[PDB]
Amino acid sequence: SQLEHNIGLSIFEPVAKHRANRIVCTIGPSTQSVEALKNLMKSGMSVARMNFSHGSHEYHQTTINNVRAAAAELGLHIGIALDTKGPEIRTGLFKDGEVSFAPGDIVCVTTDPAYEKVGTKEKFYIDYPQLTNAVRPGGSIYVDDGVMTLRVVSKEDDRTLKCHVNNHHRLTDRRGINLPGCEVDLPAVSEKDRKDLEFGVAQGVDMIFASFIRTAEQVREVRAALGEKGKDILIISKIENHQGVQNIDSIIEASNGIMVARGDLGVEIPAEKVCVAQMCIISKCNVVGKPVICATQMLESMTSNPRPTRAEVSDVANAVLNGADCVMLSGETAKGKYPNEVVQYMARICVEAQSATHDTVMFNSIKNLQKIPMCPEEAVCSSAVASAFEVQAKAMLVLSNTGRSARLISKYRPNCPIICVTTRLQTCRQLNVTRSVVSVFYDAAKSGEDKDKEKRVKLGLDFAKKEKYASTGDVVVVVHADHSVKGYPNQTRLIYLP
Amino acid sequence: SQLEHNIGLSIFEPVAKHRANRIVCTIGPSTQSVEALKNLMKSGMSVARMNFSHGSHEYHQTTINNVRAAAAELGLHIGIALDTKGPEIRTGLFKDGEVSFAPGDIVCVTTDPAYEKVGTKEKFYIDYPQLTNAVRPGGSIYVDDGVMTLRVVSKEDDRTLKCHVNNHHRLTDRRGINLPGCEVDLPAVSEKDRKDLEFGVAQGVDMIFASFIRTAEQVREVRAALGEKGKDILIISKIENHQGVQNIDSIIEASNGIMVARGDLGVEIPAEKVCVAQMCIISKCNVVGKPVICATQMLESMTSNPRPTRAEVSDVANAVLNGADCVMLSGETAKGKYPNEVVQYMARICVEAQSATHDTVMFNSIKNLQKIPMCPEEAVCSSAVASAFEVQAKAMLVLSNTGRSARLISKYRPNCPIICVTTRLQTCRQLNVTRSVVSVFYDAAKSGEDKDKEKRVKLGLDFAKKEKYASTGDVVVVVHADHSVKGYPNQTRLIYLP
Amino acid sequence: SQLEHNIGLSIFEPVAKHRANRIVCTIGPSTQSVEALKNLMKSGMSVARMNFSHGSHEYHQTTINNVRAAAAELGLHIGIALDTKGPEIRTGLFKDGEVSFAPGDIVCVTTDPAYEKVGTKEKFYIDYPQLTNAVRPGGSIYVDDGVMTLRVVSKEDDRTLKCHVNNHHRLTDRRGINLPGCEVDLPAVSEKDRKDLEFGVAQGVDMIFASFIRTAEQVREVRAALGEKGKDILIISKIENHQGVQNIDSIIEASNGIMVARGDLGVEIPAEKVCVAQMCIISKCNVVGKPVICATQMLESMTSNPRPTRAEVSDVANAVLNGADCVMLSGETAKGKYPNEVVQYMARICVEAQSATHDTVMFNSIKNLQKIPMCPEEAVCSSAVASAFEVQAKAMLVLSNTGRSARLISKYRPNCPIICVTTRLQTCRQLNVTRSVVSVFYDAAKSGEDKDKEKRVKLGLDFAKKEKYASTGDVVVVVHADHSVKGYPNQTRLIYLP
Amino acid sequence: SQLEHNIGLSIFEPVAKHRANRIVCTIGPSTQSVEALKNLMKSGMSVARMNFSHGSHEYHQTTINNVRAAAAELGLHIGIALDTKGPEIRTGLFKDGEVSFAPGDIVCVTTDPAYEKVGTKEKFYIDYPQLTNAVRPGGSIYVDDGVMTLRVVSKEDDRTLKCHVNNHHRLTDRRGINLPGCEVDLPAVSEKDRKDLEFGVAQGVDMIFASFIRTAEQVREVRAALGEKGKDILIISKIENHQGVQNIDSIIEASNGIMVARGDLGVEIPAEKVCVAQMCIISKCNVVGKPVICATQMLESMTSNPRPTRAEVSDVANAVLNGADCVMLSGETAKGKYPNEVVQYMARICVEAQSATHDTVMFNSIKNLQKIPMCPEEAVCSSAVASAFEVQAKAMLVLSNTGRSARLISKYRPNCPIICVTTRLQTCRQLNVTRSVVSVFYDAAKSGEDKDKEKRVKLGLDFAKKEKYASTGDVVVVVHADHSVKGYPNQTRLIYLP
Ligand SMILES: O=P(O)(O)OC[C@H]1O[C@@](CO)(OP(=O)(O)O)[C@@H](O)[C@@H]1O
Ligand SMILES: O=P(O)(O)OC[C@H]1O[C@@](CO)(OP(=O)(O)O)[C@@H](O)[C@@H]1O
Ligand SMILES: [Cl-]
Ligand SMILES: [Cl-]
Ligand SMILES: [K+]
Ligand SMILES: [K+]
Ligand SMILES: [K+]
Ligand SMILES: [K+]
Ligand SMILES: [Mg+2]
Ligand SMILES: [Mg+2]
Ligand SMILES: [Mg+2]
Ligand SMILES: [Mg+2]
């Protein structure tokens, strides 16, 4: 039981040497320089996130170039993720550029674009034409990240709602609007997003973090916009509202990965419900073997302070115990004073959580929910992980060109590193969002085609020795195809390191 | 499995109607008035904590009096906890009330009280007279929640250490000092602690939160300071150093319960190890059926903001999922701007985590670890909980005078309230630290002996109806003695509400 | 696991002192005398079975009278069971009163009653009018307990089947016919059976063993034939063919109990399938908490030999491990040379099987398959058994007038005796088919009405002491109602024996 | 649970197509001809047992020769077992070839061979010269499968005991004698056993069934009598006395497998304890992955009847459900009237029990008991079985030369056949005692070395197709070494049949 496992935990024992979980860092003025990014990489960053909510293509090109240069210098493969602005609802403008409200204030809100630029205390504009179908009397409209909240008293005409102001607040021009619990019908890709996706495709980003995904259809529109040239870029869907949570099964099916985007989510749904969504969404991703990222305010106070609060430490540990492949930093690295320290703390917390995890509980739980019969590559990957537990293997080694087989092994949550020998550099970069995996690049143009695997296996076992995962005489579990089967791995071997 | 349970969670189901977990609030200037206490109680405070780190006896006397008046107005039993100063260490005062340090600012710290008032960038006072024994050259001194550290360059003399300041910090007055891994030989009951405890006994406090407990022996010292008249006051040992964690088993055996005192703990040991300690301590308490409180920085940001962070909500939810009876607030209610709201958030988060909990996993895990044969009262209480599950009982009802039988039922973690009819007001107040329990007072002096239990049972069934736990036709599981047995409950009944 | 439980078994340890399973013995010329029946009772017989396939009402009246006299002499309550002849299909007669067949012989079989008395090698009569709808070409007809088998080659007209003889055999007049795998539409109660049921009702038999039950409807016709005066007599349905197995759920629902009548069953279905039916039927009875008897050839060789074969010993042990309340002797006691010895061996084998049973596996398995919410009496009975395991109770004690609550406790398979204090002597007799139960009679006419239970509880605890189930200072789990609830037990107590 | 599995069983589903369990038949006059052996083999005999209790070397030489000729005609590998006489004890001969005893017939038994031929109601011979040491006055002497017992009234002299006959028995010639609980110091290898074993080695028998093994030391004695040329012959230790059961752990560790020799066992210990011993011994063998045979009186009545009893069918089914690799026939085939039919019933019953077995309960129970870390070959074999389950493989295929790897796969109890391609004919024959395994011989001298395994794998895949285990498109789980590793299998592949 979990309870029995807890009572036997020790704070004194040595922790795991090899960190399994992965860290996504948002780049900003604290961290954009090549030097700063090197240090972020040494501290534990695996994926650099560009938040296209702010900043021009020029700003972000600089992030791209610097990330590549810092990674080249250190000889790391660092993923690059483009996180979209996404669609939004916002208010219009206000007379004099601001207005203040008091509890009890009655205010009309209108979708009549006549009122767009002349917002007053009496009446102002929201740029969502379907507003009066989307929220009904007694429902709420949140303004400005949920900070001001309105209750809908009545619908006055097909374009106007009379509302009750719930708290003191001062609005300025074009604040954000949330319609918590309401279906919101907006394109998956704005016109800005297209330009932003086109840039990403041209600069060779490894993955998109797609904002405000509500339906599987929207995932497909994002994939369509990426086009032929972007067909290999991961789409990681951001679950940010009740629709995303409701539709999660088909959203997972259509995505490469999920981000539990807790910031907007905890505005769209009651904040205390974010823990339920988080647990559910992470476990649902674990079950199908797709990467999941937990995001937003994990180590927030380290934006200004050199150590984290007690709540923050438990937050990161618990994301890891819930099952998340990745955890994410936003403000903490984009603009905070302690970018390296916050990454270093995150890394250490991940390692403690990992070391406190019961080896085999995840493996068994995940395996017990798979449909039988499995595909043969999945039988091979799950049983390779089992056989790793049986021999206390110190590493596993898999050949994967697309990354598929690596993610399939990570799905079964071994307790050791998964060394992936790949022939694609973008695969190295993309596997950064997958728990346990460490990539080595095999250059087939330079070394030859390796139909019999032996060079790639050699390279992987050499890597394992070099990086101190295992040494001579240790068993390594090795997964690839035999000499004739193409397209997936049908073979597992236990090999002693020479 | 946990995983299978997780994937079934919904954010759209109704939540539990009756909150099982319990909230401890620290009283300060925000919260000491009768009016403010009433509102804390309305918001969900079950125990008021007085922090004897600060304030005179007169100040706390006002807290005691105000809590009793508030509670009597609302008709509630609110526990009162005296939290000791203990072996605390602090700076003196400073020139102007703050000094500012830069990394490498060589600084003299002195045990000599002549510098108490008059601290400066180059010399200040610390109130631990054996300082220059406890920490030698090369050692480190942690200042104000470990935010600033000083490496000891050298011993100037028996009263004075020359220190290297290691990082940027602006220092306020009387800040806390930790010396992790140092030989600190201070009493668990100082002279000042002894007077505090005697004050507590005189004023009839329900429980002690005993700071810095390191050994079972120290628990017994606190018990001896409480003396003959203090013998029924609970001793909740606060685990907040390395030794406390080492000695947790015997500390638990000696105490009536435990606090995971994460604030000091996360300076005394590395912060990232706190999550492991927490998990281990909470589960060890659950296994023996003793109350356990998770403390410190749970909703920290709500000291100044109207909403908590995503990490803070998670922290509360997970302490509950960990198995904690109680969660605690410190500065959030003592001195924050939103004391009522922070308690209300905590309550909502508790109920959410409670509703996300698998019914029977705790019951089974805890039961599977108990020595067979059990004592009859434990066989009775655990099988009463099992029957509650089998019939989907909406409440249980137990007669308990000491509180033992209520705590024995709560040990098996039913999913419904436990209505406890008790003959002692102090039992009502002390059972505030026990998950699920709701107390009703039966005045045996005023109402008679009740040998056949019928008066107390009726009082309990009527309470169940009034507080809307159950209605006519609902089955209730009722635990007390038959007509002969004295000293424990030997009987369970299922009873339809009349 | 079962496997782990096995590897820790010891042949050397002491076996259980109190035999839980029960033995049904068929009475015949070896065993009909009062003396013989006394010895059968001392050897371990709980239920005397009268096989109304043979013998007149006069013969059976003698069994009834002698059973009662022997039981009175010993002060035991012995159940009396009337086992019906039941409906049958048989051949007609043969010329010269016999005929011999050889493999390959072609024979017409007809339902034309013209041919009833003139059976030849060429053609003979079977008295089942629906024969040519019931078996199709390629199907089989078994004659004479399956000893000769015919293959149906073709249907010649609506009353005649041309058949192929499969083995050497000699038929005499009116042999038994089985149509294996065929639905057989015959009344549940023949005209003989009515007379036999009327006798049983008038002589006060405790239970019917109803032969050849195929459908729930037939159970109801047997209950109808027993009438008002027989409404309290148990109906134990004999599963003897494929329909019975197919319809087992609704047959269990309609019966009081089941007998796995393996003799006819292993004729009607392939003999190797009888083990599958047995396991299934027993487990299905365990799950609903109704008594099940395993019957036929269990110790067959002891009909002539003074000790059993190795197969026979495993047969009885395995019936007990499968979950059967009772095991049965037929020829072994009706006409065998070693009636006492065979009962004594059976008893010893039951005790070994019982002692090798994992205490709590059954309890948990059975409980995990009950629908929630349970009725309250069932919650009380299952949790009483749980609490017996928790305290290693040496006995339980239940007040039951109809036997219902006793059977409800036995359903959860405690490892100790269940002492039932009843107010009905027929309940004492009927509880003989229920595992673990030992009855004591409370004479309410003679001792008074005992609304507060205390006399019946006294009598039960005295009994427990007398019969050496427990002694002073041992815990006994005691189940009945509280002082107001009528019609079922809503209360459990743990009581120390004074 | 077992219970839940049971209630789901159906008698109407198709049964398994490939019988996993194995049948050992004893050869005698019924079965010694080439023709009769062919038919036994066709009926499902996998191992022929020669019982060296009886017959000369010439007689058994005929058995050996006839088995090889039968097997070669049918193209089968049939194991040949030599079952030793061992420390047997028997009566001499009698006046007329039988005497009859009555309870209380005082009778003299003598070690003096002068009475060997000429035994009578008042004096007869027993062939154990130390009789009057081994059993003293008050002791008991068990005669002919314990059917008759004699209490020793007194020691007449060193050669003679005066006995009280205790029950009715008619005594035939050379009947068996047991002296349970008596000090019997006879060799495990008598002089006569030594010549028998040497004969066996000369004639190339595949295995020894070693009677009356009591200690690991005795196993080592049998091994030493087999000498250098006999070192690869399996030693199956027969457990048939009290000490054998006591010492089962070390006896198992010393042997290649075990027989539960229920005939002698059930006289040496009380008969009802045999079921416990059986369960314990079989499971201990399963846990270490050594072959285990259940023996004696399984289908006893079929010695003279065409159909078995309900107990006998049950006995076979439960030995299989217990976990036994093999079940055995003695008199049933040696000297019975229906040798072919009794083997056919046994086969059908095996397949029925096999089909009633929960797929994966054995796999998990056995795996959960193994020491971690495993050897690589065991991690490979157990995870190969798990992948077979995951893909619903219709066969596995293993290369094994010694048989070790085939037995290691069979230890984890897959539900499909295990096709073993071996380079040793003797391995083919010895793997007949291992559940599931079907052997194909690869002649490396004739066909070449096969370093890359492709010849043997093809031979195995073609066999799978021919024997209808799988067809084109079916996945098969294939276990051998990769191209480098020698001495064990380190590799698993899933392969679609071409
Ligand atoms: O790129 P993914 O989809 O992970 O597939 C990789 C698997 O397919 C194979 C065989 O096709 O690749 P490869 O041809 O490069 O050797 C296996 O060796 C390898 O494990
Ligand atoms: O005869 P059953 O149906 O078992 O019911 C017996 C139960 O009902 C009660 C109460 O009605 O019987 P009783 O009235 O004889 O005392 C319980 O005490 C007793 O356990
Ligand atoms: Cl206007
Ligand atoms: Cl005729
Ligand atoms: K964004
Ligand atoms: K304090
Ligand atoms: K009958
Ligand atoms: K022998
Ligand atoms: Mg967002
Ligand atoms: Mg503290
Ligand atoms: Mg019958
Ligand atoms: Mg023998």
PDB file of all heavy atoms in Angstrom, chain D residues 446-460:
ATOM      1  N   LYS D 446      24.176 -33.662 -38.138  1.00  0.00           N
ATOM      2  CA  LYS D 446      23.677 -33.798 -39.499  1.00  0.00           C
ATOM      3  C   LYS D 446      23.407 -32.491 -40.200  1.00  0.00           C
ATOM      4  O   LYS D 446      23.550 -32.420 -41.423  1.00  0.00           O
ATOM      5  CB  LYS D 446      22.440 -34.662 -39.557  1.00  0.00           C
ATOM      6  CG  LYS D 446      22.734 -36.137 -39.448  1.00  0.00           C
ATOM      7  CD  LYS D 446      21.562 -36.974 -39.920  1.00  0.00           C
ATOM      8  CE  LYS D 446      21.952 -38.444 -39.983  1.00  0.00           C
ATOM      9  NZ  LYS D 446      20.763 -39.330 -39.839  1.00  0.00           N
ATOM     10  N   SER D 447      22.982 -31.461 -39.451  1.00  0.00           N
ATOM     11  CA  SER D 447      22.481 -30.239 -40.094  1.00  0.00           C
ATOM     12  C   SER D 447      23.365 -29.023 -39.961  1.00  0.00           C
ATOM     13  O   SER D 447      23.103 -28.008 -40.598  1.00  0.00           O
ATOM     14  CB  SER D 447      21.089 -29.894 -39.610  1.00  0.00           C
ATOM     15  OG  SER D 447      20.205 -30.930 -39.929  1.00  0.00           O
ATOM     16  N   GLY D 448      24.356 -29.090 -39.067  1.00  0.00           N
ATOM     17  CA  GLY D 448      25.279 -27.980 -38.872  1.00  0.00           C
ATOM     18  C   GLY D 448      25.074 -27.230 -37.565  1.00  0.00           C
ATOM     19  O   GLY D 448      24.052 -27.394 -36.883  1.00  0.00           O
ATOM     20  N   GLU D 449      25.981 -26.295 -37.305  1.00  0.00           N
ATOM     21  CA  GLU D 449      26.130 -25.690 -36.007  1.00  0.00           C
ATOM     22  C   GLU D 449      24.950 -24.746 -35.598  1.00  0.00           C
ATOM     23  O   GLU D 449      24.658 -24.580 -34.395  1.00  0.00           O
ATOM     24  CB  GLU D 449      27.443 -24.911 -35.967  1.00  0.00           C
ATOM     25  CG  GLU D 449      28.685 -25.784 -35.880  1.00  0.00           C
ATOM     26  CD  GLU D 449      29.971 -24.964 -35.794  1.00  0.00           C
ATOM     27  OE1 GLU D 449      29.982 -23.784 -36.227  1.00  0.00           O
ATOM     28  OE2 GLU D 449      30.961 -25.492 -35.275  1.00  0.00           O
ATOM     29  N   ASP D 450      24.420 -24.001 -36.563  1.00  0.00           N
ATOM     30  CA  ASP D 450      23.303 -23.069 -36.298  1.00  0.00           C
ATOM     31  C   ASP D 450      23.594 -21.959 -35.277  1.00  0.00           C
ATOM     32  O   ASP D 450      22.738 -21.610 -34.459  1.00  0.00           O
ATOM     33  CB  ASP D 450      22.013 -23.828 -35.935  1.00  0.00           C
ATOM     34  CG  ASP D 450      20.744 -23.000 -36.225  1.00  0.00           C
ATOM     35  OD1 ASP D 450      20.711 -22.287 -37.259  1.00  0.00           O
ATOM     36  OD2 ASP D 450      19.774 -23.077 -35.419  1.00  0.00           O
ATOM     37  N   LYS D 451      24.749 -21.327 -35.418  1.00  0.00           N
ATOM     38  CA  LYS D 451      25.153 -20.233 -34.534  1.00  0.00           C
ATOM     39  C   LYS D 451      24.138 -19.092 -34.506  1.00  0.00           C
ATOM     40  O   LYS D 451      23.910 -18.497 -33.466  1.00  0.00           O
ATOM     41  CB  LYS D 451      26.530 -19.692 -34.938  1.00  0.00           C
ATOM     42  CG  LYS D 451      27.691 -20.600 -34.533  1.00  0.00           C
ATOM     43  CD  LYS D 451      28.973 -20.248 -35.293  1.00  0.00           C
ATOM     44  CE  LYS D 451      30.224 -20.545 -34.477  1.00  0.00           C
ATOM     45  NZ  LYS D 451      30.144 -21.878 -33.813  1.00  0.00           N
ATOM     46  N   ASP D 452      23.608 -18.713 -35.664  1.00  0.00           N
ATOM     47  CA  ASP D 452      22.673 -17.602 -35.706  1.00  0.00           C
ATOM     48  C   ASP D 452      21.226 -18.047 -35.408  1.00  0.00           C
ATOM     49  O   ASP D 452      20.312 -17.245 -35.512  1.00  0.00           O
ATOM     50  CB  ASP D 452      22.737 -16.856 -37.053  1.00  0.00           C
ATOM     51  CG  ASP D 452      22.227 -17.701 -38.223  1.00  0.00           C
ATOM     52  OD1 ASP D 452      21.753 -18.843 -38.000  1.00  0.00           O
ATOM     53  OD2 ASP D 452      22.325 -17.233 -39.378  1.00  0.00           O
ATOM     54  N   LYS D 453      21.043 -19.323 -35.038  1.00  0.00           N
ATOM     55  CA  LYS D 453      19.745 -19.862 -34.561  1.00  0.00           C
ATOM     56  C   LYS D 453      18.694 -20.051 -35.639  1.00  0.00           C
ATOM     57  O   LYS D 453      17.597 -20.496 -35.353  1.00  0.00           O
ATOM     58  CB  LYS D 453      19.139 -19.033 -33.406  1.00  0.00           C
ATOM     59  CG  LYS D 453      20.122 -18.245 -32.546  1.00  0.00           C
ATOM     60  CD  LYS D 453      21.048 -19.142 -31.763  1.00  0.00           C
ATOM     61  CE  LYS D 453      21.887 -18.325 -30.781  1.00  0.00           C
ATOM     62  NZ  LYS D 453      23.208 -18.991 -30.522  1.00  0.00           N
ATOM     63  N   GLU D 454      18.970 -19.621 -36.854  1.00  0.00           N
ATOM     64  CA  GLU D 454      17.908 -19.568 -37.870  1.00  0.00           C
ATOM     65  C   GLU D 454      17.380 -20.958 -38.277  1.00  0.00           C
ATOM     66  O   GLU D 454      16.176 -21.135 -38.500  1.00  0.00           O
ATOM     67  CB  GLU D 454      18.342 -18.740 -39.097  1.00  0.00           C
ATOM     68  CG  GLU D 454      18.409 -17.223 -38.833  1.00  0.00           C
ATOM     69  CD  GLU D 454      17.052 -16.630 -38.394  1.00  0.00           C
ATOM     70  OE1 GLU D 454      16.065 -16.770 -39.144  1.00  0.00           O
ATOM     71  OE2 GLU D 454      16.954 -16.064 -37.279  1.00  0.00           O
ATOM     72  N   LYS D 455      18.240 -21.961 -38.289  1.00  0.00           N
ATOM     73  CA  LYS D 455      17.746 -23.277 -38.622  1.00  0.00           C
ATOM     74  C   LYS D 455      16.786 -23.820 -37.572  1.00  0.00           C
ATOM     75  O   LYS D 455      15.722 -24.395 -37.914  1.00  0.00           O
ATOM     76  CB  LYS D 455      18.880 -24.258 -38.878  1.00  0.00           C
ATOM     77  CG  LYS D 455      19.686 -23.972 -40.160  1.00  0.00           C
ATOM     78  CD  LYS D 455      20.605 -25.158 -40.454  1.00  0.00           C
ATOM     79  CE  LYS D 455      21.935 -24.746 -41.060  1.00  0.00           C
ATOM     80  NZ  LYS D 455      23.064 -24.891 -40.082  1.00  0.00           N
ATOM     81  N   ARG D 456      17.152 -23.677 -36.292  1.00  0.00           N
ATOM     82  CA  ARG D 456      16.307 -24.216 -35.237  1.00  0.00           C
ATOM     83  C   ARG D 456      15.013 -23.427 -35.093  1.00  0.00           C
ATOM     84  O   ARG D 456      13.954 -24.006 -34.855  1.00  0.00           O
ATOM     85  CB  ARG D 456      17.048 -24.306 -33.914  1.00  0.00           C
ATOM     86  CG  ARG D 456      18.172 -25.329 -33.955  1.00  0.00           C
ATOM     87  CD  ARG D 456      19.014 -25.272 -32.720  1.00  0.00           C
ATOM     88  NE  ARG D 456      19.932 -24.158 -32.776  1.00  0.00           N
ATOM     89  CZ  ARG D 456      20.683 -23.771 -31.750  1.00  0.00           C
ATOM     90  NH1 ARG D 456      20.548 -24.377 -30.559  1.00  0.00           N
ATOM     91  NH2 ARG D 456      21.613 -22.818 -31.914  1.00  0.00           N
ATOM     92  N   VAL D 457      15.070 -22.130 -35.346  1.00  0.00           N
ATOM     93  CA  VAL D 457      13.874 -21.333 -35.216  1.00  0.00           C
ATOM     94  C   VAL D 457      12.904 -21.716 -36.302  1.00  0.00           C
ATOM     95  O   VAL D 457      11.746 -22.012 -36.033  1.00  0.00           O
ATOM     96  CB  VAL D 457      14.173 -19.816 -35.190  1.00  0.00           C
ATOM     97  CG1 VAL D 457      12.917 -19.018 -35.424  1.00  0.00           C
ATOM     98  CG2 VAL D 457      14.785 -19.437 -33.852  1.00  0.00           C
ATOM     99  N   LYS D 458      13.421 -21.909 -37.503  1.00  0.00           N
ATOM    100  CA  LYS D 458      12.558 -22.278 -38.608  1.00  0.00           C
ATOM    101  C   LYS D 458      11.904 -23.651 -38.386  1.00  0.00           C
ATOM    102  O   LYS D 458      10.716 -23.846 -38.658  1.00  0.00           O
ATOM    103  CB  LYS D 458      13.347 -22.276 -39.903  1.00  0.00           C
ATOM    104  CG  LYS D 458      12.557 -22.755 -41.104  1.00  0.00           C
ATOM    105  CD  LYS D 458      13.232 -22.299 -42.383  1.00  0.00           C
ATOM    106  CE  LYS D 458      12.211 -22.146 -43.497  1.00  0.00           C
ATOM    107  NZ  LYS D 458      11.620 -23.470 -43.828  1.00  0.00           N
ATOM    108  N   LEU D 459      12.717 -24.608 -37.973  1.00  0.00           N
ATOM    109  CA  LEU D 459      12.245 -25.912 -37.585  1.00  0.00           C
ATOM    110  C   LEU D 459      11.104 -25.781 -36.574  1.00  0.00           C
ATOM    111  O   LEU D 459      10.116 -26.537 -36.615  1.00  0.00           O
ATOM    112  CB  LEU D 459      13.391 -26.690 -36.965  1.00  0.00           C
ATOM    113  CG  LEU D 459      13.230 -28.194 -36.826  1.00  0.00           C
ATOM    114  CD1 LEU D 459      12.948 -28.822 -38.189  1.00  0.00           C
ATOM    115  CD2 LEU D 459      14.494 -28.780 -36.226  1.00  0.00           C
ATOM    116  N   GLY D 460      11.226 -24.812 -35.673  1.00  0.00           N
ATOM    117  CA  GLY D 460      10.208 -24.632 -34.622  1.00  0.00           C
ATOM    118  C   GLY D 460       8.966 -23.944 -35.136  1.00  0.00           C
ATOM    119  O   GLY D 460       7.859 -24.291 -34.740  1.00  0.00           O
TER     120      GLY D 460
END
